[PDB]
Amino acid sequence: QSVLTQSPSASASLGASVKLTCTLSSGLRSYTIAWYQRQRGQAPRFLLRLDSVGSHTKVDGIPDRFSGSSSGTERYLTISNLQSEDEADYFCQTWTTGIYIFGGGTRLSVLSQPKASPTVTLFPPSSEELQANKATLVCLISDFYPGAVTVAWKADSSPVKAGVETTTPSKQSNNKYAASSYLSLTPEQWKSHRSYSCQVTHEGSTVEKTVAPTE
Amino acid sequence: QVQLQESGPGLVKPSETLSLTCAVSGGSISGNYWSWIRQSPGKGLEWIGHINDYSGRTDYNPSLKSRVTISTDTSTNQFFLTLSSVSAADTAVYYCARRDTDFWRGIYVFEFWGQGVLVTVSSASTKGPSVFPLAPSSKSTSGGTAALGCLVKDYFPEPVTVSWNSGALTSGVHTFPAVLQSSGLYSLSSVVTVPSSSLGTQTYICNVNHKPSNTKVDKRVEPKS
């Protein structure tokens, strides 16, 4: 049960400071970790090693605004004076008798322009598709910044996870982002519920659109 | 310092063998721990194994040991990964890397990495799309406008092109990037925002062309009565 736990996402604006946390399982509480950065389309970069008492090894080529500290089971990466190029996945790692343990990574968004909230357009299955014995709900998400969203689907009021396919956000020509999410149902499932909902979460706030088969 | 670069096929059929090459420069003459690591969608990174090119000996992740081979070609500054009998679980970005030899405070780390290569395990073959109309809705549009569209479902490979009214309609068109589904097939949506007053008189047709399958569809998108 050697586990490194990281929150999946974080966001901050240019010039701010952020502290990312790696939490060590109790059996690993005295272990050394390494921090890495992965910028989009770039090779991961080793940033530093950090031991249980807070000593670290600075790495050649890594800006001084990256530093590390420790407290009990927690290992921190602090990034001061955030630059646009600091937007990246940050992941921690340790080593236990020839086994590498990785954290899940924290995706840090660094805003270099103001937050923009998503437009959400939800389409029900077409009658033509239902005649082909299929049903797809289409949730189109546009004009948001930063490019990080989560999507949750509901049947009536109950969460639905099966049959969901969601894109990674992609940058539009206007520098905001777009994404789409598709929910696959049988025609019988579609016609038997009162409604289905697509809920988009972006920087803490939510937008939920709903469609009903009786429409 | 050390530079690494992965290469190899981006698609592998289920039950076949995945092969990747790493090209290196700036390494030691001898004594490098040339390593492979992968990250699957939604999961954390996973070490695959390494070879030390002084000893020639390999170490593999036990969960993959039966399927993995790592080897070197010092004469061309390359090393290699093979992974046999692949399944969907092996779809991942694959990285080559170099482990350190400092063992500072009891950890080994990956001091240098390549940019990674995506390998998708896929049984998909050339297939034309099904095209469905997305009838106009004004629930989420600005005043006086409606969004209508076409759902272009279950095609392979990319790309598809979508035009509207044979290219006469370009303003207000947003063709979204496709989703690669777990089936191995792509789906995308193209939506156009038009004046609501036009819905009674103006005809809207999406023109879908899937050149790989030589399939074309011209789908009328009508208001719901």
Residue numbers in the entry:
A (entry chain L): 1 to 9, 11 to 27, 27A, 28 to 52, 52A, 52B, 52C, 52D, ...
B (entry chain H): 1 to 52, 52A, 53 to 82, 82A, 82B, 82C, 83 to 100, 100A, ...
Article excerpt on this structure:
HIV-1 Env is a homotrimer of gp120-gp41 heterodimers that mediates fusion of the host and viral membrane bilayers to allow entry of viral RNA into the host cell cytoplasm. We characterize Ab1303 and Ab1573, heterologously-neutralizing CD4-binding site (CD4bs) antibodies, isolated from sequentially-immunized macaques. Fab-Env cryo-EM structures show that both antibodies recognize the CD4bs on Env trimer with an ‘occluded-open’ conformation between closed, as targeted by bNAbs, and fully-open, as recognized by CD4.
Ab1303 sequences were derived from rhesus macaque germline V gene segments IGHV4-160*01 and IGLV4-97*01 gene segments for heavy and light chains, respectively, and exhibited 8.3% and 8% amino acid changes due to somatic hypermutations, respectively. For both antibodies, there were no major structural changes between their free (solved by X-ray crystallography) and bound (solved by cryo-EM) forms: Root mean square deviations, rmsds, for superimposition of free and bound Ab1303 VH and VL (235 Cα atoms) were 0.72 Å, and 0.89 Å for superimposition of free and bound Ab1573 VH and VL (231 Cα atoms), with minimal differences in the complementarity determining region (CDR) loops. Thus, Ab1303 and Ab1573 bound their Env antigen targets using preformed antibody combining sites, rather than undergoing structural rearrangements to accommodate their targets. Similar to the results for b12, Ab1303 and Ab1573 did not bind BG505 that was captured by PGT145, suggesting that the closed Env trimer occludes epitopes for Ab1303 and Ab1573.
